[PDB]
Design an enzyme around this catalytic site. Structure first.
Site, short mmCIF file in Angstrom:
data_model
loop_
_atom_site.label_atom_id
_atom_site.label_comp_id
_atom_site.label_asym_id
_atom_site.label_seq_id
_atom_site.Cartn_x
_atom_site.Cartn_y
_atom_site.Cartn_z
N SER A 124 -8.24 -5.30 0.24
CA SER A 124 -9.30 -4.33 0.26
C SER A 124 -10.33 -4.61 1.41
O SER A 124 -10.84 -5.73 1.53
CB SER A 124 -10.00 -4.34 -1.09
OG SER A 124 -10.93 -3.31 -1.13
N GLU B 203 -13.09 2.77 1.68
CA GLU B 203 -12.16 1.65 1.49
C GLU B 203 -10.85 1.89 2.23
O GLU B 203 -10.15 2.89 2.03
CB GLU B 203 -11.88 1.37 0.01
CG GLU B 203 -10.87 0.26 -0.21
CD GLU B 203 -10.72 -0.22 -1.64
OE1 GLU B 203 -11.37 0.33 -2.53
OE2 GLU B 203 -9.94 -1.14 -1.85
N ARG C 145 -14.47 -7.24 5.53
CA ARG C 145 -14.24 -7.77 4.18
C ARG C 145 -15.10 -9.00 3.91
O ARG C 145 -15.12 -9.93 4.71
CB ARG C 145 -12.75 -8.08 4.09
CG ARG C 145 -12.23 -8.59 2.77
CD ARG C 145 -10.69 -8.55 2.84
NE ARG C 145 -10.01 -9.34 1.80
CZ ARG C 145 -10.03 -9.10 0.48
NH1 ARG C 145 -10.70 -8.09 -0.04
NH2 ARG C 145 -9.35 -9.92 -0.34
N1 LIG Z 1 -13.97 -7.50 -0.44
C1 LIG Z 1 -14.30 -6.36 0.21
O1 LIG Z 1 -15.04 -6.44 1.38
C2 LIG Z 1 -13.94 -4.95 -0.28
C3 LIG Z 1 -13.89 -4.70 -1.65
N2 LIG Z 1 -13.99 -3.41 -2.12
C4 LIG Z 1 -13.91 -3.18 -3.58
O2 LIG Z 1 -14.25 -4.38 -4.21
C5 LIG Z 1 -13.56 -4.55 -5.43
C6 LIG Z 1 -12.96 -5.95 -5.51
O3 LIG Z 1 -12.09 -6.12 -4.41
P1 LIG Z 1 -11.97 -7.54 -3.68
O4 LIG Z 1 -13.28 -8.22 -3.69
O5 LIG Z 1 -11.33 -7.21 -2.36
O6 LIG Z 1 -11.09 -8.44 -4.68
P2 LIG Z 1 -9.85 -9.39 -4.25
O7 LIG Z 1 -8.96 -9.59 -5.43
O8 LIG Z 1 -9.17 -8.75 -3.11
O9 LIG Z 1 -10.71 -10.66 -3.73
C7 LIG Z 1 -10.38 -11.90 -4.25
C8 LIG Z 1 -11.54 -12.87 -4.31
O10 LIG Z 1 -10.73 -13.86 -4.88
C9 LIG Z 1 -10.76 -15.08 -4.20
N3 LIG Z 1 -9.44 -15.39 -3.63
C10 LIG Z 1 -8.53 -16.21 -4.25
N4 LIG Z 1 -7.45 -16.35 -3.46
C11 LIG Z 1 -7.69 -15.61 -2.35
C12 LIG Z 1 -6.89 -15.42 -1.27
N5 LIG Z 1 -5.78 -16.17 -1.21
N6 LIG Z 1 -7.35 -14.61 -0.26
C13 LIG Z 1 -8.59 -14.00 -0.32
N7 LIG Z 1 -9.38 -14.19 -1.42
C14 LIG Z 1 -8.94 -15.00 -2.42
C15 LIG Z 1 -11.89 -14.97 -3.17
O11 LIG Z 1 -13.01 -15.66 -3.69
C16 LIG Z 1 -12.17 -13.47 -3.03
O12 LIG Z 1 -13.58 -13.23 -2.85
C17 LIG Z 1 -12.48 -3.47 -5.49
O13 LIG Z 1 -12.84 -2.53 -6.47
C18 LIG Z 1 -12.51 -2.86 -4.11
O14 LIG Z 1 -12.33 -1.48 -4.31
C19 LIG Z 1 -14.15 -2.33 -1.26
C20 LIG Z 1 -14.18 -2.55 0.10
C21 LIG Z 1 -14.09 -3.85 0.58
#
Ligand SMILES: NC(=O)C1=CN([C@@H]2O[C@H](COP(=O)(O)OP(=O)(O)OC[C@H]3O[C@@H](n4cnc5c(N)ncnc54)[C@H](O)[C@@H]3O)[C@@H](O)[C@H]2O)C=CC1
Length: 200
Positions: free
Chosen positions: A110, A147, A80
């Protein structure tokens, strides 16, 4: 099942309200209410706070149950990418960079089993047998990137933190499969965090 259908919607659009709502962040309130009305969790178009909260609970529970119903896989690590060096996240950064710390992620989490999406922070997340994460497969809205999603309240142990600019970091990074998308640049990576999901 209605539960799998709710998880499909979460993937497509619902994640944009639900993760902020579960973290306690400001979230789009009108959009949450419209989603609940649209999907019939609410009948009143002027729900009380109680009715609204209860309806959000059923909706989140439906998404989690649909997730839970998906087949388990043999994955033992996932990745992630996070942007943690925003000022507004300074607290969150401190939590994730405290060695030994235990963090409860309140949203759905995610991850990718295949590659890490480059960001200031790469999470290298080890999993023990029987964990709650599930590969979405064709339940995902946009397919062709794998994912593994986890339900709310995943508990993560911070095992080691590896800052950029050392041989250790260079070696550890070389052993990750990184996204090679249109704007990929590994020079943006500030840290790797080695973590472990604590089951039970
Ligand atoms: N992040 C990843 O490595 C993965 C994301 N995806 C895809 O990416 C898209 C967006 O998903 P995500 O980026 O996972 O959005 P998310 O809502 O899970 O990530 C939140 C973002 O919000 C912030 N944040 C605020 N409070 C946080 C907390 N307490 N813990 C962690 N982060 C916090 C961070 O800057 C982080 O980068 C989705 O459509 C998903 O399908 C797919 C696989 C992996």
């Amino acid at each position: 099942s209605k539960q799998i259908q709710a998880l499909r919607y979460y993937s497509a659009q619902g994640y944009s309200v639900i993760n902020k709502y579960l973290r306690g962040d400001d979230y789009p309130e009108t959009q949450a209410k419209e989603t609940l009305l649209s999907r019939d969790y609410l009948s009143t178009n002027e729900p009380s706070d109680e009715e609204f909260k209860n309806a959000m609970s059923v909706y989140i529970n439906d998404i989690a149950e649909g997730l839970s119903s998906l087949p388990e896989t043999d994955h033992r690590v996932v990745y992630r990418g996070l942007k943690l060096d925003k000022p507004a996240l300074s607290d969150v950064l401190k939590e994730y960079t405290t060695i030994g710390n235990i963090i409860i992620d309140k949203a759905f989490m995610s991850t990718s089993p295949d590659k890490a999406w480059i960001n200031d922070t790469i999470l290298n997340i080890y999993l023990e047998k029987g964990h709650k994460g599930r590969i979405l497969g064709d339940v995902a809205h946009f397919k062709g990137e794998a994912e593994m999603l986890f339900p709310p309240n995943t508990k993560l142990k911070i095992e080691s933190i590896v800052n950029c600019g050392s041989q250790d970091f260079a070696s550890q990074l070389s052993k990750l499969r990184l996204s090679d998308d249109a704007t990929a640049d590994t020079n943006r990576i500030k840290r790797i965090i080695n973590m472990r999901v604590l089951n039970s």
